[PDB]
Amino acid sequence: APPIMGSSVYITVELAIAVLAILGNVLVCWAVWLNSNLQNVTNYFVVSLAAADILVGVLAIPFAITISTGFCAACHGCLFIACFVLVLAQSSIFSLLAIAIDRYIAIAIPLRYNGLVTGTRAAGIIAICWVLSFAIGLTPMLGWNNCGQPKEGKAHSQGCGEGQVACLFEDVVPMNYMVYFNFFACVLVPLLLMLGVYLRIFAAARRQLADLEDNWETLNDNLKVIEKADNAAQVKDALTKMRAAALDAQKFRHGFDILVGQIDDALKLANEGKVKEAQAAAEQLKTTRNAYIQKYLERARSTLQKEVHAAKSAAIIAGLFALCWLPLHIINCFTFFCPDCSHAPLWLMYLAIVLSHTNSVVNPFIYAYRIREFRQTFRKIIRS
Ligand SMILES: CC(C)CCC[C@@H](C)[C@H]1CC[C@H]2[C@@H]3CC=C4C[C@@H](O)CC[C@]4(C)[C@H]3CC[C@]12C
Ligand SMILES: CC(C)CCC[C@@H](C)[C@H]1CC[C@H]2[C@@H]3CC=C4C[C@@H](O)CC[C@]4(C)[C@H]3CC[C@]12C
Ligand SMILES: CC(C)CCC[C@@H](C)[C@H]1CC[C@H]2[C@@H]3CC=C4C[C@@H](O)CC[C@]4(C)[C@H]3CC[C@]12C
Ligand SMILES: CCn1c(=O)c2c(nc(/C=C/c3ccc(OC)c(O)c3)n2C)n(CC)c1=O
Ligand SMILES: CCCCCCCC/C=C/CCCCCCCC(=O)O
Ligand SMILES: CCCCCCCC/C=C\CCCCCCCC(=O)O
Ligand SMILES: CCCCCCCC/C=C\CCCCCCCC(=O)O
Ligand SMILES: CCCCCCCC/C=C\CCCCCCCC(=O)O
Ligand SMILES: CCCCCCCC/C=C\CCCCCCCC(=O)O
Ligand code: NA
C-alpha cells in the first residue's frame, strides 16, 4: 500500500497528541502562575516537566513527523531533529528524580525542609538539569553518530545531494548510544534510583505512623498500669516512661506543657511515697489527653497521610513515564542485541513512538484527578 496512507494515520495521531500535550501542560503552567497556593519548590519541577511536554508538542512531534519521511537532509541537521526529543526526555527524567528527592526531604527531615529546599536553589538545579539534558541528548552531535558511514544507496535512490542522507532515525543515531548510553545509563538507572527513593519515602511514612500509634498506646497503657498499681515505685516507673515519651512526641505546645507538668506533679508525689495522691494526679492526664494530645495525634496522622497521597501521585507520574517510554527502548534492545531477529515492523515502531509521545499528555490528568488545588484551579481557569 502507498506509504502515504499508513503515514497519514501515524501523522494524524501525532498531531492529535501534540495538540493535547500543549493544551494540558499550558493549563498546568497557567495554574501554577496564577495560584500562589501552588507556588512551591515541588511545583517548579512540575512546571519544568510541563515545559518539556509543551516542547514535545511544539518541536519533538513535528521533528518526529519530519524524520518519518526519510527526506534528504544534511546528516548533522538530520541528527539534531532526531536527537532533540532525547533532550526533552532527559529533562523530564531529571525533573521526576528531583520531585522524588524533594518529597523524600519533606518526609524525612521536615524540620529543615524549608531551609534546605528553597525556590532560588530549585531554579538553579532546574537550569543545571536543562544544560545537562542538552549535553546528554545531543551527545551524538559531538561525534557519536553514523554520519561517517552514510547509506549512499538509499541517498542516491532518493536523489539526495552531496553531503546529504535520507533522514531516518536509525540511520544517523547509533544503536549502541541508544541502548548503553541513553537507555541503560541515562534512563534505566535514574528510574531505578527513583524507585529506591519512593521505597524510602513510603517506608519512612509507615514507620512514622507506627511511631505515632506506639506513643499513643504507651501513654494509655502506662495510665492503666498506674491505675492498678499498689505502690509508689510502680507509679514512678510508669510515669518515667510517660515523661520520656511525651517529650519525644513533642519533638499544641500548651497541651504538651500541661502533660509533662502533670507527669512531673505525679512523679514528685510518687517519689515522696504518696501513691494514692500520685495516682489521682496522673488521672488528670486524661483530661489533657482528650482535649489536646489526641487532636495533635490526628493532625500529625492526617499530615502524614497527605504526604503519602502526594508521594503516590508523584510516583504514578514517574511510573507512567516508564510505561510510555519502555516499549520503544525495549524494541531498540531487540534491534541492537538480536541482529538475527527480524526488525520490529514499521507499524509497531510507530505505535511505540506515539506511545512515548502520549506521556506528554497524561500528567495534567493525574494532577487534576489527584490534587485538589490543581483541580480547583483548573476549573476556575476553564470556567472564567
Ligand atoms: C525557537 C524554535 C522555534 C526554533 C526551531 C528551529 C528548527 C525548526 C531548526 C533549527 C535547526 C534546523 C535544521 C538545521 C539543518 C538542517 C539540514 C537541512 O539539510 C534540512 C533542514 C535541517 C534538518 C533543519 C531543520 C529545521 C531546524 C531543526
Ligand atoms: C513496558 C511494558 C509495557 C512491556 C512492553 C513489551 C514490548 C515492548 C515487547 C513485548 C514483546 C516484544 C516483541 C517480541 C518479538 C519480537 C520479534 C523480533 O523479531 C523483533 C522484536 C519483537 C517485535 C519484540 C518487540 C518488543 C515487544 C513488543
Ligand atoms: C525492569 C525492566 C523493565 C528493565 C528493563 C529490561 C530490559 C533491559 C530487558 C527486558 C527484556 C530483555 C530482552 C529479552 C530478549 C532478548 C533477545 C536476545 O536475543 C537479546 C537480548 C534481548 C533483546 C533482551 C534485552 C534486554 C531486555 C529488553
Ligand atoms: C526514543 C528516541 N527515538 C527512537 O529511539 C526512535 C525513533 N524512531 C525510531 C525508529 C524509526 C524507524 C525504524 C525503522 C524504519 O523502517 C524500517 C522506519 O521507517 C522508522 N527509533 C528507534 N524516535 C522517533 C523519532 C525516537 O524518538
Ligand atoms: C532561542 C533559541 C535559540 C536557538 C539556537 C539554535 C538552536 C538549534 C541550532 C541548530 C543546530 C546546528 C545546526 C544543525 C546542523 C547543521 C547541518 C550541518 O552541519 O550540515
Ligand atoms: C512555534 C515553533 C515553530 C517551530 C517548529 C515548526 C515546525 C518544525 C517542523 C520541522 C522542520 C524540519 C522540516 C524541514 C524539511 C526540509 C525539506 C527539504 O529538505 O527540502
Ligand atoms: C505551534 C506550532 C508548532 C509547529 C506547527 C507546524 C506543524 C508541523 C507539522 C509537520 C511538519 C512536517 C514537515 C514535512 C517534512 C518534509 C517532507 C518532505 O520533504 O518529504
Ligand atoms: C556541555 C555542558 C556540560 C556541562 C554542564 C554544566 C552544568 C551546569 C552549567 C551551568 C549552570 C548555570 C546555572 C548556575 C546556577 C546554579 C545555582 C544553584 O545551584 O542554585
Ligand atoms: C556528559 C555531561 C558531562 C557533565 C559535566 C559535569 C560538569 C557539571 C557538574 C555540575 C555543576 C554543579 C553546579 C555548580 C555551579 C555553581 C554552584 C553554586 O554556586 O552553588
Ligand atoms: Na515528560
CATH of the domain at 120: 1.20.1070.10
Ligand 1 contact via 80 beta carbon (within 6 Å): yes
Cα pseudo-dihedral 123, 127, 129, 132, rounded to 10: -170
In a domain, 201, yes or no: no
Annotate 260-307 with DSSP letters as a single string: HHHHHHHHHHHHTT-HHHHHHHHHTHHHHIIIIIHHHHHHHHHHHHHH
User: CA-to-CA distance for 178 and 196, rounded, in angstroms?
Assistant: 24
Ligand nearest, relative to CA of residue 121: 8
How far apart are the two ends of the chain, measured CA to CA in Å? 49
Query: Closest Cα partner for 101 from 228, 204, 193, 6?
Result: 193
Ligand 1 contact via 245 beta carbon (within 6 Å): no
- Alpha carbon distances (Å) from 356 to 3, 264, 319, 329, 368: 22, 63, 13, 10, 21
State the distance from the centre of ligand 10 to the C-alpha of 359, rounded, in angstroms.
6
The alpha carbon of 65 is separated from its chain's Cα centroid by a whole number of angstroms, namely 29
Backbone angles phi, psi at 74, to 5 degrees: -55, 135
Domain at 213, CATH number: 1.20.120.10
User: CA-to-CA distance for 240 and 270, rounded, in angstroms?
Assistant: 11
Q: Which residues lie closer than 8 Å to 169 by C-beta, 6 or more apart?
A: 67, 82
Backbone angles phi, psi at 174, to 5 degrees: -70, 145
**Mutational pocket test of ligand 6: of 66, 67, 83, the residue with most ligand atoms within 8 Å of the beta carbon:** 66
In a domain, 141, yes or no: yes
Q: How many domains does the chain have?
A: 2
User: CA-to-CA distance for 35 and 39, rounded, in angstroms?
Assistant: 7
169 and 239: one domain? no
User: CA-to-CA distance for 382 and 252, rounded, in angstroms?
Assistant: 40
Ligand 8 contact via 131 beta carbon (within 6 Å): yes
**Mutational pocket test of ligand 9: of 121, 132, 180, the residue with most ligand atoms within 8 Å of the beta carbon:** 132
283 and 137: one domain? no
In a domain, 107, yes or no: yes
Answer yes or no: are the C-beta atoms of 44 and 99 closer than 8 Å: no
Q: Which residues line ligand 7 (CB under 6 A)?
A: 58, 62, 65-66, 69, 71
150 and 63: one domain? yes
153 and 26: one domain? yes
Ligand 1 atom at minimum distance from 63 CA = 28
User: CA-to-CA distance for 221 and 270, rounded, in angstroms?
Assistant: 18
In a domain, 44, yes or no: yes
Annotate 233-251 with DSSP letters as a single string: HHHHHHHHHHHHHHHHHH-
Choose one of 298, 332, 353: the last residue of a domain.
298
Answer yes or no: are the C-beta atoms of 41 and 98 closer than 8 Å: no
Q: Which residues lie closer than 8 Å to 16 by C-beta, 6 or more apart?
A: none
User: CA-to-CA distance for 132 and 140, rounded, in angstroms?
Assistant: 14
In a domain, 312, yes or no: no
Q: After which residues does the chain break, using C–N > 2.5 Å?
A: 251
User: CA-to-CA distance for 254 and 249, rounded, in angstroms?
Assistant: 13
- Can you say whether the dihedral through the CA atoms of 382, 102, 192, 173 is positive or negative? positive
User: CA-to-CA distance for 212 and 249, rounded, in angstroms?
Assistant: 8
**343 torsion bin: left (phi>0), alpha (psi -120 to 50), beta (else):** beta
User: CA-to-CA distance for 81 and 67, rounded, in angstroms?
Assistant: 7
Choose one of 243, 271, 298: the last residue of a domain.
298
H/E stretch holding 118: none
Query: HSE-up of 112 (CA within 13 Å, CB side)?
Result: 4
Nine cell digits for residue 78: 538530520
Bridge partners (DSSP) of residue 165 are 73
Bridge partners (DSSP) of residue 166 are 72
SS3 assignment, position 165: strand
11 and 129: one domain? yes
- Alpha carbon distances (Å) from 366 to 55, 88, 359: 19, 20, 11
State the distance from the centre of ligand 10 to the C-alpha of 222, rounded, in angstroms.
53
Which domain, by its residues, includes 264?
Answer: 209-298
- Alpha carbon distances (Å) from 247 to 80, 145, 218, 258, 272: 61, 63, 13, 12, 23
11 and 55: one domain? yes
In a domain, 102, yes or no: yes
18 and 162: one domain? yes
- Alpha carbon distances (Å) from 69 to 62, 147, 158: 12, 18, 11
48 and 153: one domain? yes
214 and 277: one domain? yes
Cα pseudo-dihedral 358, 364, 366, 372, rounded to 10: -170
State the distance from the centre of ligand 4 to the C-alpha of 17, rounded, in angstroms.
17
State the distance from the centre of ligand 8 to the C-alpha of 86, rounded, in angstroms.
19
**Atom 1 of ligand 1, residue of closest alpha carbon:** 59
In a domain, 307, yes or no: no
State the distance from the centre of ligand 1 to the C-alpha of 244, rounded, in angstroms.
68
49 and 99: one domain? yes
8 and 148: one domain? yes
H/E stretch holding 183: none
**Atom 22 of ligand 3, residue of closest alpha carbon:** 334
Answer yes or no: are the C-beta atoms of 278 and 289 closer than 8 Å: no
159 and 215: one domain? no
Residue with cell 525533573: 95
Nine cell digits for residue 285: 492526664
Query: Closest Cα partner for 106 from 48, 45, 25?
Result: 45
**Atom 2 of ligand 1, residue of closest alpha carbon:** 59
User: CA-to-CA distance for 258 and 260, rounded, in angstroms?
Assistant: 6
Ligand 5 contact via 76 beta carbon (within 6 Å): yes
Choose one of 298, 328, 358: the last residue of a domain.
298
**Residues shown for the chain:** 384
For ion ligand 10, residues whose CB falls within 5 Å = 53, 92
In a domain, 155, yes or no: yes
Annotate 287-298 with b (16+ C-beta within 10 A) or e (fewer): ebbeebbeebbe
